[PDB]
Amino acid sequence: MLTKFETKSARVKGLSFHPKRPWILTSLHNGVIQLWDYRMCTLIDKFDEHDGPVRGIDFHKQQPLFVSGGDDYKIKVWNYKLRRCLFTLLGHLDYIRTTFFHHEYPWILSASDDQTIRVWNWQSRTCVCVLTGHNHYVMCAQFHPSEDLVVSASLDQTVRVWDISGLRKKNLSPGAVESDVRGITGVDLFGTTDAVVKHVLEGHDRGVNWAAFHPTMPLIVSGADDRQVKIWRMNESKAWEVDTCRGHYNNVSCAVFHPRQELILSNSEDKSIRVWDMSKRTGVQTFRRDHDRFWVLAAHPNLNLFAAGHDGGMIVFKLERERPAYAVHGNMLHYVKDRFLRQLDFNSSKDVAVMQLRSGSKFPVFNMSYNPAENAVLLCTRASNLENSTYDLYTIPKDADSQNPDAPEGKRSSGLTAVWVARNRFAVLDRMHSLLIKNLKNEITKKIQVPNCDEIFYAGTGNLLLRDADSITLFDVQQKRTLASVKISKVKYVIWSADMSHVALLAKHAIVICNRKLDALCNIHENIRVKSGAWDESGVFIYTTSNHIKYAVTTGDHGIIRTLDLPIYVTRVKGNNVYCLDRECRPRVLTIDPTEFKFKLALINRKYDEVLHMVRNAKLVGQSIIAYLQKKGYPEVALHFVKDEKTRFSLALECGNIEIALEAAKALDDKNCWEKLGEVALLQGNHQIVEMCYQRTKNFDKLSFLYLITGNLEKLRKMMKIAEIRKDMSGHYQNALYLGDVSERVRILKNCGQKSLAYLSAATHGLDEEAESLKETFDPEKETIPDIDPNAKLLQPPAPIMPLDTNWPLLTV
Template identity: 90%
Template sequence: AGHDGGMLVFKLERERPALAVHGNSLFYVKDRFLRQLDFGSSRDVAVMQLRRHGCPGPRIPETQPKIRPKIPTNALFPPQRASNLENSTYDLYTIPKDADSQNPDAPEGKRSSGLTAVWVARNRFAVLDRMHSILIKNLKNEITKKVPVPNCDEIFYAGTGNLLLRDSDSITLFDVQQKRTLASVKISKVKYVIWSADMSHVALLAKHAILICNRKLESLCQIHENIRVKSGAWDESGVFIYTTSNHIKYAVTSGDHGIIRTLDLPIYVTRVKGNNVYCLDRECRPRVLTIDPTEFRFKLALINRKYDEVLHMVRNAKLVGQSIIAYLQRKGYPEVALHFVKDEKTRFSLALECGNIEIALEAAKALDDKGCWEKLGEVALLQGNHQVVEMCYQRTKNFDRLSFLYLITGNLEKLRKMMKIAEIRKDMSGHYQNALYLGDVAERVRILRNCGQKSLAFLTAATHGLDEEAESLRESFDPEKETIPAVDPEARLLQPPAPVLPLDTNWPLLTVSKGFFEGSIAGKGKGGALAADIDIDAVGTEGWGEDAELQLDEDGFVDAGEGFGEEGTGKGQEEGGGWEVEEDLDLPPELDVPAGPAGAAEDGFFVPPTKGTSPAQVWCNNSQLPVDHILAGSFETAMRLLHDQVGVTNFGPYKQLFLQTFSRGRTTFQALPSLPAMYGYPHRNWKEAGVKNALPAVGLKLNDLIQRLQLCYQLTTAGKFEEAVEKFRLILLSVPLLVVDNKQEIAEAQQLVAICREYIVGLSMEIERKKLPKETLEQQKRICEMAAYFTHSNLQPVHMILVLRTALNLFFKLKNFKSAATFARRLLELGPKPEVAQQTRKILAACEKNPVDSHQLNYDQHNPFDICAASYRPIYRGKAVEKCPLSGACYSPEFRGQICRVTTVTEIGKDVLGLRISPLQFR
């Protein structure tokens, strides 16, 4: 059927099969037979034949046919309610006990009117009549009770003596015997109700939503789908398995849900057992599909705290994936993910989250990343693990924090080493700070003297009682030029307190029992835990000797010959007998290897280091987008790409765009005075760029061009056509210099090109039309033709109103009343201002009095055409046409090979690859 937005497709017959599950059997209707399928043996037999309905096109209702819940002796078959409620009926059948599957009987059923019928007891069923009352009937189809429910439009089975009543926006649990409401939940337009085997949970299925509740109709979770929910069934473990048009999905009562597998065609689930899903397809053929229940069973085991099952599945199932890891983190089980994650970066994050310093330390050693060491140091500091904190500060060379750590732990010996290291590094501030921590006044005086701070050095020495140093400094002052500072007699010696009990061990932690997973991990790798308990300071004694301590000079370096005994390396101790080194090997004489580095130095041979790849070259290597090459400064390759992709042959108009883009490709900063500026290369993929995968940051965004487009619209409305054309053309030329990330943005960029083309062609034609003389009839006809062509451009409504008004006035003056009337009707359809509409109606009334055209024009409004952007004449459909490879502007064949009038840069009719503005277009 036709619709404003397209077409609507209606089904003539219901495709959903009528089915019901009882015990280990499935009852379903196929070809006017009630059939029974045994799930265990897969035996499928016809039980009985159904009588043919008299009303045209009877169908099974929205609710499933309710087979009796105890002994399958009776069955209700209510047909789909008709559009006329008077025609809605149901049938009550007695199922034959000894049915002949080859030639089943056709028992006579009892038919009565009603919208829906469901069982409420062993020998009672409820009927919703057209007056919206519930009738309780016996097996003789006789009314035993009547319950009015005015707002109910559907009823569903809810166990013995209960019903679920549906109204416009909720479902109500109703006790039929006591005639009272037990519970209610908000959900609109429920189509199916599916109870679990023990009736403890219920799934309410709407068109695009599922609401799972408990027996008291308390909402547990709600799931929304983008496409129709078709069917569902409960798993043995309490997971709801449901289908949409193209997926089998699961839903746990806690709210977790996901996809199990995809489907080629819709199916209707009847039962779920183990790894098998029993279902019917739309041809009513029973099918069994195999699924992988690992994911939802894993989540269910976590929810139910069955950690032994979780651990078994972690070790034996293929559960590794970012979704599972994220789920475990979200649910507060990072230690579980830590058990099976192999990626060191992920292990590091998980270990920090669950406070496992040992595993985080192992991962940090493997990653050896400064950021990881910093994060580990922060977490270890919170736990009081100062040994790991010390290692982290050493790895990151955070000397200030390391010195403060030694101060608060009372480790003065290492603090003296830090003072020595600061002196070697020529870090005067750090050197002085460590001297303050240690209370070393003499060292502070020496530092101040070396820094040229004689006054401070003198005051420090005099105040702290270093008389010899103070006198030496006093003599160094020039009385004529310098003033000797006065010493405060009240000044006192301030020394940091000596550590009473240096902290050698980590802060004590509370003793807690390990969790299930922590115990399993600890039992799996005890060696690693033992290695982590070794004191870092214990290394370097006994067998290691003093060789672990380098004797540094003032620059922090050691000569190669020092530290190996008085004679140096050449005269050191020979290798011990424990080293089985054999020097007398029989080697072939042709292996004459030249001397080592010493010989090379004597020959004066120098091997320069290999030149690295610049970031700009990396950008060019990694991308085929023109803008990346422009940002890298490779204009030649960028021009070649623009030529091959969109047919650019005239690069003059692109010069300013190239220079503007290139200027955004790097940053500059002044490192040291009197030295050249240094360059920085910002990346758009900086998170995963690395050394070889970097791509430049792009300053021009699609949204920027869309904002410029609004300015062009304003110029067009104001009648500044020439300025608007220039702005539209600038946007058009900027589109090939974009970088977008998805298909939607690619489509938006292509739409932007089409908008610019339509406006450039139309406005250029309007500018040309205004320049034409109006003296002769032919000139006036040509003016009218161009105005008519402009009305076929794809413009905004506000601009189309202006274009149609111009064409209407010109054609009315030319006395082409038939065409003018057409323009008037199109103008009124756009809803102009009241005064414009009133004037247009007057012109239309005048045209309808004499609906003829006085002059023949080259214009046929009923024959689709494109406008030639060079000659401004129509190219009707079926005629030969050449197009601009960038804008898509149309031209007559004689203009092939010329420069496009719309873009001013591309060659008409050139064979190209097409617009490329996203990496997705190269995959």
């Protein structure tokens, strides 16, 4: 037993399990009612609906509501989504012990401690029916999964089976016209206290406090004020079917059947919760949890967990399996047993499930294993780890125990374990708790064989006969020898391709998919360890790593195919579909699409024309179509998507033709881009394009520098003026030098107020007159000879080239 949930609330008189969802309601003696998401751990609601004890609690899930009944003497209906009181109705004139909801119309049943249980119709003004019989308290009313009948447990020493659509109960003799009820000695003795009798049941244990059913059985068990539990047939009122379970020490508050085990779980107002044998009907074992007394019990009609309410609070407790072994063939999931019986196949986003016949497991699973050709299933039965049990083989597409006993298919024989192994019809078995090999002599092997033995490892489960004592050991087909042992880190699972020759093992990042023995074919790219993923024999690997099913790869493409609304494990890939089942084991299926897959299959084979159609909004994203296609240094993909002003910018430098850059740079509304593309421009060779860019980034001085280098003199002058005003002394200043005469500087420098510098520059060119002007306007003294000349010839022949390097030739490829 595992404790899923345990919240101390104080004395819970009523407890009920939601049939739709894995929720619990508790009604407390403190007058508070609480609705719990016991799996999620999130309080849904909490209401103080009455000062004193609220003894009865129910789900009213026909429309999303819960119903409570309290000692206010009322049955009240409550919203769990809007937290408001939907409707209020007069159940009775005393304590509402248990309440039950009709699924016919919004009718509500309340069982009370004033000896009647009544059903009331809100939708109309009518109280449709009152069901009477008790002479002392109806402690409990309980639904079967059909809505026609209910059972009530009362402390007048009976259990009364009622009809809710009926006036009290509904029955009529076909052998007589007279009423079924007799107040006289007939073939049984009872009073006149009913309209008619469909079924008056024993409840004698000095009154039964509660009654409840197994979800798939008409049988009911009742706990009563004494110290016994008595199991009843409510479908016949037999007294040759009723066995008494003895173990408890004081008044048993309830007893209900465990849906998922072959035991009956009871709880009593002593201090113990006792567990009972349901093939022997006496106490297997007693547990004390020391929360003292238990006044309520509950068994899940959604066959999830199990719960019992105590005087400290309640516990929902777990007797279920986690991470089961499974394999998918074409449309059949085969898995190892979990709650809610056998399920699987169909759906794709819903948490509903539905049945198909593909049970790999139909008996206690010692082993469940697929054939490597996927044609048989081996199920090993009668448990044990001694040296013998039974093993039953089933056919894989549709599974029975035996298909026919008169046909080779579906046979059984002895063997502690038998598990299939490669050569694709073979199996290896343990029948002495050694490794023995199994043949039948042609077809998938069903018959027990004793030759060949080993002295290492110990029988268990597998798919290649896994055995453990310190590692997971693969065993051979026809040899006693260990084929190989694997040791690695796991996430509690073993993943098969679908063929059970091969195995996938989980590692520190993702999963690795491997062949028979331990040989690693490839590694799935993905940062974290996947929960499960399976390969369609190889190639197309589909996996779950969250709430979505995505392909690790198909033909070098990468895609997330679709998301489901639940966390899940891939069951495996056999066919185009991928099939999944989770811990609770609800299915999702998903067709492998030609969405993400076609697009990149096409882009890889350099098709852009194909790819435009392929572009859809089921796969567009942001960077797999509209900006992933700007990721070629010799643009190809890049040419195709260029819609973003940034992608356009990028495209241009990758070609080296910046004509497009300037425009993208423009449409990026930014200077930085113009200077950087201008530099790239100078690199392709041509300075016209550089000028334009550099001019608008305002790098007139860079231009001034560039310009004799380029051999322009006309353009070089334009730079000088528009750098004059900036007082860029390594911009405006340059150009005068660069033309044969220096006069440009002389004026700019005059405006700077740098009269000295202006004179020196001018004077040397033999423009002593201008040099003198500067001296005269400002401080004179021009006579001085610095570490540089102040009057020696400056003349330079400017640019001998007739065509300039703004006109640098180009062809462009």
